[PDB]
Amino acid sequence: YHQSYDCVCVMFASIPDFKEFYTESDVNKEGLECLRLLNEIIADFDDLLSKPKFSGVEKIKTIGSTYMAATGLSARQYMHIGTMVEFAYALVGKLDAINKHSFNDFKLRVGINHGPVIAGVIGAQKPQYDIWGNTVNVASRMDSTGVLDKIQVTEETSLILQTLGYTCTCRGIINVKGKGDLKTYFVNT
Amino acid sequence: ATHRLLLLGAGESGKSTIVKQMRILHVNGEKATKVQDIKNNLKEAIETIVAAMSNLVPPVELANPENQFRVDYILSVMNVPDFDFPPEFYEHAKALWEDEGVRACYERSNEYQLIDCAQYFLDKIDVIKQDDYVPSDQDLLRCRVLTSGIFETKFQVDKVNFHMFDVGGQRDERRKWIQCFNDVTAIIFVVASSSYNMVIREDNQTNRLQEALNLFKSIWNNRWLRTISVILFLNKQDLLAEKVLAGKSKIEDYFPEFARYTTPEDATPEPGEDPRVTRAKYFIRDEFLRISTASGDGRHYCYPHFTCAVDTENIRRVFNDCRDIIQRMHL
Amino acid sequence: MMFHKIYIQKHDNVSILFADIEGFTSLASQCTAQELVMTLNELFARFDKLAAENHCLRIKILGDCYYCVSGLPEARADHAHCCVEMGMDMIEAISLVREMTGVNVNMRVGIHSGRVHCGVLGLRKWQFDVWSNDVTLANHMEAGGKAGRIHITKATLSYLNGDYEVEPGCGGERNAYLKEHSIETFLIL
Ligand SMILES: Nc1nc2c(ncn2[C@@H]2O[C@H](COP(=O)(O)OP(=O)(O)OP(O)(O)=S)[C@@H](O)[C@H]2O)c(=O)[nH]1
Numbered sequence: 001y002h003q004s005y006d007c008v009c010v011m012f013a014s015i016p017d018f019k020e021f022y023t024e025s026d027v028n029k030e031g032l033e034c035l036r037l038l039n040e041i042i043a044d045f046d047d048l049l050s051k052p053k054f055s056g057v058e059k060i061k062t063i064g065s066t067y068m069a070a071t072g073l074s075a076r077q078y079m080h081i082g083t084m085v086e087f088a089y090a091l092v093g094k095l096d097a098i099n100k101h102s103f104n105d106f107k108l109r110v111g112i113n114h115g116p117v118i119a120g121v122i123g124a125q126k127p128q129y130d131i132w133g134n135t136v137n138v139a140s141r142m143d144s145t146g147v148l149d150k151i152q153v154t155e156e157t158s159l160i161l162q163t164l165g166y167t168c169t170c171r172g173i174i175n176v177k178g179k180g181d182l183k184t185y186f187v188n189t
Numbered sequence: 190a191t192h193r194l195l196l197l198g199a200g201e202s203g204k205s206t207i208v209k210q211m212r213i214l215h216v217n218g219e220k221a222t223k224v225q226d227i228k229n230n231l232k233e234a235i236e237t238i239v240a241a242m243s244n245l246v247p248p249v250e251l252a253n254p255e256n257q258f259r260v261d262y263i264l265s266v267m268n269v270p271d272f273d274f275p276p277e278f279y280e281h282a283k284a285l286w287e288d289e290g291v292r293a294c295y296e297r298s299n300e301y302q303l304i305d306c307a308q309y310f311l312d313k314i315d316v317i318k319q320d321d322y323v324p325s326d327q328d329l330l331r332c333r334v335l336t337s338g339i340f341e342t343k344f345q346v347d348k349v350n351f352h353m354f355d356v357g358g359q360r361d362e363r364r365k366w367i368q369c370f371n372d373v374t375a376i377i378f379v380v381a382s383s384s385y386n387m388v389i390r391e392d393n394q395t396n397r398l399q400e401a402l403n404l405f406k407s408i409w410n411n412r413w414l415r416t417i418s419v420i421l422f423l424n425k426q427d428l429l430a431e432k433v434l435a436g437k438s439k440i441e442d443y444f445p446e447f448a449r450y451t452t453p454e455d456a457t458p459e460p461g462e463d464p465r466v467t468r469a470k471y472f473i474r475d476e477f478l479r480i481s482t483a484s485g486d487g488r489h490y491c492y493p494h495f496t497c498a499v500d501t502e503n504i505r506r507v508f509n510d511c512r513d514i515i516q517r518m519h520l
Numbered sequence: 521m522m523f524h525k526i527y528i529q530k531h532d533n534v535s536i537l538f539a540d541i542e543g544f545t546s547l548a549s550q551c552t553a554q555e556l557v558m559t560l561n562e563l564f565a566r567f568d569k570l571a572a573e574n575h576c577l578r579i580k581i582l583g584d585c586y587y588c589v590s591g592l593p594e595a596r597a598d599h600a601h602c603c604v605e606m607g608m609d610m611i612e613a614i615s616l617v618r619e620m621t622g623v624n625v626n627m628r629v630g631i632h633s634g635r636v637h638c639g640v641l642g643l644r645k646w647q648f649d650v651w652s653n654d655v656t657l658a659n660h661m662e663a664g665g666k667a668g669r670i671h672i673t674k675a676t677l678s679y680l681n682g683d684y685e686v687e688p689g690c691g692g693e694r695n696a697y698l699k700e701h702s703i704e705t706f707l708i709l
């Protein structure tokens with residue numbers, strides 16, 4: 001069965017610099033070694049879910065080297081949006097530790113939005129939980145048009161974050177493919 | 190049995206030279222392509238010294254105003270794409286290399302970026318200039334060419350295979366090392382002991398030996414090398430002694446802690462080794478031992494070796510000692 | 521050990537097919553989140569069925585992006601024909617979904633053949649995925665595809681043994697990646 005929700009906070013956090021780092025050679029076993037490092041990265045991110053403060057976070061899937069998660073699938077009334085941002089900071093703490101041991105400079109680029117979504121499975125093969133909707137499309141656009149080391153949020157999302165005590169900055173007005181002109185913000189660290 | 194060895198260390202420590210010894214010792218048309226590389230070292234050495242003369246503080250002056258014209262020459266061809274290397278070049282170079290000023294500037298070469306094979310190639314210009322010139326084994330050892338990317342080298346010592354991996358030691362290169370961490374028999378960390386009075390190329394401020402120490406700590410305490418042992422090569426042992434005995438650049442002026450240091454009891458000096466030298470080389474080793482002592486007990490160890498990579502004779506000795514460590518420990 | 525165990529395995533002689541809806545962000549804007557997930561499901565259910573008949577193994581579904589590879593898990597020298605047959609059926613399937621629904625759906629089919637790494641990543645929420653330069657190419661063949669037809673590389677044509685009629689694709693002029701990598705494309709009839 002497919003359930004409908006009203007307020008869900010979706011998130012996409014990419015590592016743009018990976019695609020370049022990945023190369024297929026005989027020394028690195030046709031690129032297997034590069035995938036071994038991603039497996040370490042994605043694994044470090046995953047164990048944050050075991051922390052008590054992140055019990056409300058749901059890892060949906062992993063697109064490439066992009067980590068997709070969402071909060072509010074279990075339902076200070078809007079705290080779930082503020083929490084997703086807290087998780088964004090945590091992924092940076094983890095990605096930075098990976099940098100310290102692999103002598104790299106990988107930086108995270110985040111995009112968060114919120115709204116109505118549709119949860120459930122799809123197709124005829126495997127029981128894979130996924131969330132759909134415009135809310136999810138925009139979150140992904142908030143990540144693809146973002147800046148490294150920044151959490152880009154939509155306008156509506158900016159309001160809610162401010163109420164919870166967060167500060168924001170106006171990225172400007174950019175044309176998002178398919179959606180038109182949206183005004184976006186950048187959460188202040 | 191097969192062993193996979195990875196060479197780690199900062200830029201110019203002596204990694205690529207160690208692989209050239211494995212070829213000379215256990216592996217062995219191309220020798221003619223290295224000529225072009227050797228001539229480049231020569232060109233880069235002369236121009237770097239000359240160009241540095243006016244920038245030092247205080248500026249060093251030529252002893253023969255005649256050479257001022259030759260100075261003008263070297264510079265006019267500094268960044269020329271493909272230099273044909275005419276007979277004039279070698280002449281100008283040689284005259285400059287004999288000028289006391291150019292020599293005084295060379296003595297203070299630790300204050301600007303200069304290649305290690307400088308004094309060696311400049312001393313044999315009359316040999317490299319010939320058209321019938323054939324590079325010696327020692328010539329290839331000294332020749333310098335930056336390493337970029339990863340390189341594998343397979344060899345054999347008494348029907349036992351060894352895969353050697355050579356990587357770039359410069360900051361930007363380090364990011365590829367990770368690709369070899371998994372399934373490594375042991376690590377060979379190389380250090381430029383003689384580089385205590387120099388600075389790295391990347392920023393022109395961080396002390397070279399300190400960059401080595403920090404890098405070692407980063408490798409020793411790495412989360413993916415928790416059980417991999419490290420064979421430490423305190424390379425450039427020849428230049429360390431020459432520097433210590435010359436007394437121009439004092440070791441305690443860079444690393445203050447030296448003043449409160451005495452040679453250890455278990456110290457085994459070389460026959461005919463100066464007390465000053467002994468005390469110096471063991472000091473540098475102890476710095477790296479202080480790091481390896483504090484962590485990863487029993488899981489992995491560190492084995493120090495005094496090394497001079499361009500001494501085909503010395504490398505046989507210490508590599509056979511390594512072959513011992515590897516087999517004796519079941520690695 | 522020191523590196524988390526990695527459940528990945530290399531595989532040569534495989535075909536990777538990618539499909540994507542054109543203007544999906546635009547579509548999710550017009551109709552209700554419910555109807556969208558329903559029309560999107562009507563399509564994927566049929567695809568998943570066709571995947572079994574054509575000897576293809578479906579990988580994931582990222583919004584409107586659908587991908588499956590032939591020649592896995594068990595090696596199949598018939599591979600490249602499976603993906604072509606898959607896309608063939610896919611196109612008709614989309615035609616009927618557009619027919620009974622009344623929704624403007626169109627898709628781009630991109631196929632390529634080469635080696636592929638496969639397995640899973642991380643610790644939580646595992647989903648069988650594939651990675652490799654060749655996989656990256658199949659994806660770009662879809663982006664650089666032509667709406668309604670089947671875009672394939674020369675590598676794939678060499679595994680077809682001359683059974684399908686094609687025409688000059690011109691993928692180099694529709695996608696920067698295919699040009700910069702000197703890829704010769706073709707369109708099936
Ligand atoms: N005198 C002397 N010169 C040495 C010694 N070891 C290396 N050299 C010289 O130092 C130079 C640099 O050594 P090299 O091995 O090329 O550095 P590297 O560590 O490989 O450098 P990289 O490729 O990471 S950037 C070479 O000219 C080499 O001959 C040594 O023990 N004594």
Ligand SMILES: C=C[C@@]1(C)CC(=O)[C@]2(O)[C@@]3(C)[C@@H](O)CCC(C)(C)[C@@H]3[C@H](O)[C@H](OC(C)=O)[C@@]2(C)O1
Nearest residue numbers: 019022063064065066650651652653655656659
């Ligand atoms: C991990 C590296 C590399 C190169 C491996 C690879 O083939 C990919 O994972 C594919 C193509 C591939 O896994 C198929 C799915 C999808 C989602 C299309 C991937 C992304 O485009 C990845 O890039 C991004 C941007 O994450 C990419 C290209 O990344």
Ligand SMILES: Nc1ncnc2c1ncn2[C@@H]1CC[C@H](COP(=O)(O)OP(=O)(O)OP(=O)(O)O)O1
Nearest residue numbers: 130131137140178541542543544545546582583
């Ligand atoms: N559940 C999901 N999982 C993963 N990615 C998703 C999911 N839902 C949506 N997406 C994403 C983010 C936006 C993307 C669909 O838009 P896409 O980038 O394909 O553009 P588009 O369909 O508007 O146009 P086009 O494909 O023609 O360029 O798919």
Ligand SMILES: [Cl-]
Nearest residue numbers: 199202381401
């Ligand atoms: Cl060094």
Ligand SMILES: [Mg+2]
Nearest residue numbers: 204205335336
């Ligand atoms: Mg080198």
Ligand SMILES: [Mg+2]
Nearest residue numbers: 540541542544
């Ligand atoms: Mg689309």
Ligand SMILES: [Mg+2]
Nearest residue numbers: 540583584585
């Ligand atoms: Mg898409």
